[PDB]
Design an enzyme around this catalytic site. Structure first.
Site, PDB file in Angstrom:
ATOM      1  N   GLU A  84       0.926  -1.350   0.075  1.00 51.51           N
ATOM      2  CA  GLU A  84       0.103   0.025  -0.068  1.00 51.51           C
ATOM      3  C   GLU A  84       0.843   1.301  -0.135  1.00 51.51           C
ATOM      4  O   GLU A  84       2.080   1.278   0.535  1.00 51.51           O
ATOM      5  CB  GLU A  84      -1.066  -0.013   1.088  1.00 51.51           C
ATOM      6  CG  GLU A  84      -2.045  -1.083   1.209  1.00 51.51           C
ATOM      7  CD  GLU A  84      -2.894  -0.898   2.524  1.00 51.51           C
ATOM      8  OE1 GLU A  84      -3.865  -1.493   2.317  1.00 51.51           O
ATOM      9  OE2 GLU A  84      -2.461  -0.041   3.430  1.00 51.51           O
ATOM     10  N   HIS A  91       3.612   0.814   2.698  1.00 50.04           N
ATOM     11  CA  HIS A  91       3.719  -0.260   3.786  1.00 50.04           C
ATOM     12  C   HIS A  91       3.182  -1.616   3.032  1.00 50.04           C
ATOM     13  O   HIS A  91       2.182  -1.346   2.252  1.00 50.04           O
ATOM     14  CB  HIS A  91       3.252   0.203   4.983  1.00 50.04           C
ATOM     15  CG  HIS A  91       1.722   0.459   5.074  1.00 50.04           C
ATOM     16  ND1 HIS A  91       1.291   1.607   4.498  1.00 50.04           N
ATOM     17  CD2 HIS A  91       0.658  -0.190   5.005  1.00 50.04           C
ATOM     18  CE1 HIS A  91      -0.232   1.559   4.595  1.00 50.04           C
ATOM     19  NE2 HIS A  91      -0.540   0.425   4.829  1.00 50.04           N
ATOM     20  N   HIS A  93       0.814  -5.102   4.145  1.00 45.86           N
ATOM     21  CA  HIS A  93       0.147  -5.839   5.225  1.00 45.86           C
ATOM     22  C   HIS A  93       0.413  -7.352   4.855  1.00 45.86           C
ATOM     23  O   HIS A  93      -0.011  -7.863   3.878  1.00 45.86           O
ATOM     24  CB  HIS A  93      -1.228  -5.517   4.855  1.00 45.86           C
ATOM     25  CG  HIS A  93      -1.731  -4.198   5.244  1.00 45.86           C
ATOM     26  ND1 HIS A  93      -2.163  -3.798   6.814  1.00 45.86           N
ATOM     27  CD2 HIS A  93      -1.913  -3.006   4.828  1.00 45.86           C
ATOM     28  CE1 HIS A  93      -2.529  -2.428   6.810  1.00 45.86           C
ATOM     29  NE2 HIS A  93      -2.161  -1.862   5.351  1.00 45.86           N
ATOM     30  N   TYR A 151     -10.842  -5.500   4.734  1.00 39.53           N
ATOM     31  CA  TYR A 151     -10.020  -4.483   4.862  1.00 39.53           C
ATOM     32  C   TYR A 151      -9.041  -4.219   3.655  1.00 39.53           C
ATOM     33  O   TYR A 151      -8.502  -3.101   3.282  1.00 39.53           O
ATOM     34  CB  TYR A 151      -9.381  -4.612   6.080  1.00 39.53           C
ATOM     35  CG  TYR A 151     -10.113  -4.600   7.445  1.00 39.53           C
ATOM     36  CD1 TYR A 151     -10.764  -3.394   7.667  1.00 39.53           C
ATOM     37  CD2 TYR A 151     -10.730  -5.625   7.913  1.00 39.53           C
ATOM     38  CE1 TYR A 151     -11.631  -3.140   8.771  1.00 39.53           C
ATOM     39  CE2 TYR A 151     -11.255  -5.656   9.277  1.00 39.53           C
ATOM     40  CZ  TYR A 151     -12.028  -4.422   9.512  1.00 39.53           C
ATOM     41  OH  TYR A 151     -12.948  -4.395  10.447  1.00 39.53           O
TER      42      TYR A 151
HETATM   43 MG   LIG Z   1      -2.898   0.522   5.465  1.00 34.98          MG
END
Ligand SMILES: [Mg+2]
Length: 209
Positions: A84, A91, A93, A151
């Site tokens: 992202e 970053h 995930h 998410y």
């Molecule tokens: Mg994020």
């Protein structure tokens, strides 16, 4: 049954002198000159994908999963990794299945993985990034598969940069926005219908845990 996942948020250096000062020229060449192209099945816009941080991010995720597999003794463990562009930092995930790593020893294992990345990717340089290698806590948090469509999947460009998975139901979704859109709606439809079933249920022990 589908397992739970740990989440490790990894900040990715996106500025050489500010994040990796004094890093070797070969790293510099690698990051500056490496070209990326989207797969045929992707509907994303390459012009919105920062390739140099993507180049580092790919190796970070690559090396993390190698070390995770060794340390967990789970060679084909399930993962979903999403790259992202955040408000302040690029970053990743990193979602990896908890199998083989009991929560009690996760932190110690992660530190081992952390030093490996530093040694293998940053040539000993501790990257100048705040809290750049952190596991999601509540103790160590365990999310189920639903975290991905809830998410991660709804992210769009330029927040969404790239994604990797070995999870078969999310392969085409990694770099295809339309497929992501489909899966979110599909999941939410199932969630909604699950909610409705709960309300309409007239069976004993309908006691919400
Ligand atoms: Mg994020």
């Amino acid at each position: 049954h589908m397992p739970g996942f740990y989440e490790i948020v990894i900040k990715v250096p996106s500025d050489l002198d500010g994040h990796l000062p004094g890093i070797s020229d070969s790293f510099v060449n690698w990051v500056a000159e490496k070209e990326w192209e989207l797969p045929p099945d992707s509907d994303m816009d390459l012009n919105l994908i920062e390739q140099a941080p993507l180049t580092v991010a790919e190796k970070l995720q690559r090396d993390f999963l190698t070390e995770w597999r060794r340390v967990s003794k789970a060679p084909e463990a399930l993962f979903f990794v999403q790259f992202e562009k955040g408000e302040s930092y690029f970053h990743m995930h990193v979602l990896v299945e908890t199998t083989g790593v009991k929560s009690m020893v996760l932190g110690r294992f992660l530190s081992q993985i952390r030093e490996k990345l530093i040694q293998r990717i940053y040539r000993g340089i501790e990257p100048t990034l705040p809290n750049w290698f952190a596991v999601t806590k509540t103790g160590n948090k365990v999310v189920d598969e639903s975290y991905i469509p809830n998410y991660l999947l709804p992210k769009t460009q330029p927040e969404l940069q790239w994604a990797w998975t070995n999870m078969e139901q999310y392969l085409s979704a990694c770099l295809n926005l339309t497929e992501r859109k489909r899966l979110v709606a599909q999941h939410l439809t199932h969630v909604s219908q699950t909610q409705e079933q709960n309300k309409e249920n007239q069976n004993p022990n309908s006691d919400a845990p």
